[PDB]
Amino acid sequence: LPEHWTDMNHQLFCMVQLEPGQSEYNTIKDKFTRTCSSYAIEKIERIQNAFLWQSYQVKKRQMDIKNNNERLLFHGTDADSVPYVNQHGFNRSCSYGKGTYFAVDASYSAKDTYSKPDSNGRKHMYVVRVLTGVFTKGRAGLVTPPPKNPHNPTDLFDSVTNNTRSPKLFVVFFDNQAYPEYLITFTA
Amino acid sequence: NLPEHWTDMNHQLFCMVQLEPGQSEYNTIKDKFTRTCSSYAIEKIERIQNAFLWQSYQVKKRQMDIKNNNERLLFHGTDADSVPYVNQHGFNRSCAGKNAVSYGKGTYFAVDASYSAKDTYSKPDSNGRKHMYVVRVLTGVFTKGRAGLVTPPPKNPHNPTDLFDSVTNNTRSPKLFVVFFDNQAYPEYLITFTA
Ligand SMILES: CN(C)CC(=O)Nc1ccc2[nH]c(=O)c3ccccc3c2c1
């Protein structure tokens, strides 16, 4: 488990609210305001999920071995999906393909369509480690990433993007490819 | 890290190992198959040695043993065309076929081999070969399913994140299980058989 995590008293999951003014809080704030300077951050929480982390890191080492595979991306969701995501992560079962979507810019996940405001006006987006690895442009109807070689349909790309030259979003089609690291609660 | 009974796979992240009849390993799998499919003939049995699928699955199994008898050895019949993909990548619910009677949108596994042996599942290729996997499936704690499930239901309606590990057709007498997550099943053997 990461050293910068706080003690979880032999628990496997906990949300650790960050302290403003500290490097950790500010680093995340900086990546958000970089494109969302008009929004007001209410709080930032470090998601400490021992189980999700384990599966993700296993996935990461497999990808490093099989091929710079990790990207820090954004994911805005409604309030109701937050509890599930904290515990279980991102599910494709819940358009450049039918997987989970993650934005390069926080501005993109800030849209009400994504970070849908709750009755109190709060919006939610995750700061996510995503295993984008080797990618290709996507297309609707993808249920899995395309094969690197059409004549070896089992060697797959790790993710897809909207535009390979200037990626603004990535899509992953498997469970343990995204780790929600922080949850940003913010308002207008 | 990998099972010590596995053949060397040097430099391979994966390989299919053909089993020898007369062996406990081959014979036992044959016995579980013929237990309900005595009318079919087994062409061959291959052990699936997938390093990555195994690692992920075992991490997932470790986690379900802590959170909660979570593993079942079940059958999965597929067409020939899905074999290559399942060997490398395992079972995908996004590519999963609608079951005749549906208890959710995930990958299905049978208790009896007789069930998976139906042409609708282990579809005969042009040569008449049928295919089914022997799978280690993390069923864990389960409940009766229902169509339109995209994940397992919560053990409790008011704590919607604490989920069941799988769903079945009948809790008292389970003949099939459905899993909705990627590494809850490891394809351990591939049974090729004929009429
Ligand atoms: C039908 N979908 C709109 C359901 C949904 O929840 N989508 C969703 C939900 C969250 C999303 N978060 C993102 O950062 C993002 C970035 C680029 C493109 C999409 C997203 C994004 C999309």
A164 by Cβ neighbours in 10 Å (0-12 / 13-18 / 19+) ranks as exposed
Q: Does residue A146 come out as left (phi exceeding 0), alpha (psi in the -120 to 50 range) or beta?
A: beta
Beta bridge partners of A125: A76, A184
Topology (CATH) of A1-188? Phosphoenolpyruvate Carboxykinase; domain 3 (3.90.228)
Q: Please tell me if the CB atom of residue A75 comes closer than 6 angstroms to any atom of ligand 1.
A: yes
| Chain B residues close to A153, C-beta within 8 Å | 84-85
Q: State the number of CA atoms in the 13 A half-sphere of A103 facing the CB.
A: 19
Q: How far is A1 from chain B (nearest CA, A)?
A: 14
d(CA B49, CA B65): 23
Q: Cα A46 to chain center, whole Å?
A: 13
d(CA B2, CA A55): 17
Q: Please tell me if the CB atom of residue A142 comes closer than 6 angstroms to any atom of ligand 1.
A: no
Structure tokens belonging to residue B20: 């020898």
Give the distance (Å) from ligand 1 centre to CA of residue B106: 22
d(CA B195, CA B186): 27
d(CA B122, CA B109): 12
Backbone torsions φ then ψ of B130, nearest 5 degrees: -115, 155
d(CA A174, CA A163): 20
The secondary element (H helix, E strand) that includes residue A85 is: helix A82-88
Q: What approach was used to elucidate this structure?
A: X-ray
**Resolution number, Å:** 2.2
Q: Is B131 helix (H, G, I), strand (E, B) or coil?
A: strand
Cβ separation of B95 and A54 shorter than 8 Å? Answer: no
Number of A–B residue contacts, CB under 8 Å = 64
| Chain A residues close to B150, C-beta within 8 Å | 91, 93-94
Nearest CA to ligand 1 atom 9: A114
Number of other residues whose CB lies within 10 A of the CB of residue B19: 16
Query: Counting atoms of ligand 1 from 1, which one is nearest the CA of A168?
Result: 17
Cβ contacts of A101 within 8 Å, gap of 6 or more = A75, A169, A170, A171
Q: Is A12 helix (H, G, I), strand (E, B) or coil?
A: coil
**A50-66 vs B51-67: helix crossing angle, rounded to 10:** 170
CA end-to-end distance (rounded Å), chain B: 39
Cβ separation of B94 and A94 shorter than 8 Å? Answer: no
| Chain B residues close to A59, C-beta within 8 Å | 56
Handedness of CA B120, B121, B125, B130 (dihedral sign): negative
Q: In the 8-state DSSP scheme, what is residue B91?
A: -
Query: A66: closest CA among B89, B62, B95?
Result: B89
Q: Please tell me if the CB atom of residue A124 comes closer than 6 angstroms to any atom of ligand 1.
A: no
User: Domain B1-195 carries which CATH code?
Assistant: 3.90.228.10
